[PDB]
């Protein structure tokens, strides 16, 4: 019909994640994203192959380029294992000792957003 196949693929992905409705040009955005990713990966593969002094590129060059790209760009938070270690090293410190309060106590002034610039002059 009107659409090409790639637009249908992207719409199907959006459906899969559970997106009911959306702005139209989102699909164009996704197409440009995929195109740019592929082109940059190929360009990097060219350099990594020419470094190895060999003819037209192959699987190994592409995989190396993808590894280098992923070591930089497509990121996400560290895993559970590292977080558990830092958590263990953090929880050992003591907590404050509760006492009756006339409302919660704020931290000291030297560490609060209540300091005027010293250059500025004040007026009466």
């Amino acid at each position: 019909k009107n659409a090409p196949r790639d637009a249908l693929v992207m719409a199907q992905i959006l459906k899969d994640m559970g997106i009911t409705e959306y702005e139209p040009r989102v699909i164009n955005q996704m197409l440009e994203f995929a195109f740019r990713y592929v082109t940059t990966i190929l360009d990097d593969a060219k350099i990594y192959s020419s470094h190895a002094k060999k003819p037209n590129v192959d699987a190994d060059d592409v995989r190396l380029a993808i590894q280098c790209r992923a070591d930089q760009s497509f990121t996400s938070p560290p895993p559970r294992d590292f977080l558990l270690d830092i958590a263990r090293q953090k929880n050992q410190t003591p907590l404050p000792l509760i006492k009756p309060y006339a409302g919660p106590r704020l931290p000291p002034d030297r560490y609060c957003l209540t300091a005027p610039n010293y250059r500025l002059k004040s007026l009466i």
Binding site: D71, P79, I86, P107, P108, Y111
Partner: protein
Amino acid sequence: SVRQKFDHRFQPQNPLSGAQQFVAKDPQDDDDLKLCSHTMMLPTRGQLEGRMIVTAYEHGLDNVTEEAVSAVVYAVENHLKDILTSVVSRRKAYRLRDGHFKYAFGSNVTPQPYLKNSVVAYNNLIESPPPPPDDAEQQAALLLACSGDTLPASLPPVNMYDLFEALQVHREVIPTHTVYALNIERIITKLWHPNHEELQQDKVHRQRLAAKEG
């Protein structure tokens, strides 16, 4: 319709399945690394070679060209200096040459831009055609006068908060995700500032010292 609602969701690839396998070698006394966390110093050329060879081994290599050691030493020093520059920029003025080259990191010249005198001095004292001592002394006095800081103040030594803010802002000084992600979390767990009670004891000790001085 509902049952087949969560069957095509995203399944992130676990990052550990591609973890490196560790093989035990002979425990010898000569085979030691000296990670900089242990020895509170930068590693010398010789010390770096021991661990470079050890790492190379697990990848099926023979030895290092001995020009690589120099490059790695230079790069490590360069990278540390880059981070230090990022941290310094956030709490001191500086100048610019050619638009990016930052050299004079004191807080001195910084002509206040809203003074008619500053506007005039900027045009001349900055664009110098590319110095008798009396003239230089006069012009230094002028630059200090225009800066506007009548009663300059200073900061305590560099602490954790400065590093945290610097790293959060710039973030192009650590392009690699692995180095940044693991160390930022560590930095978070070392943030600290004295609480009310400690400040009270500081008050008391100051009273004590003042008294014993009188």
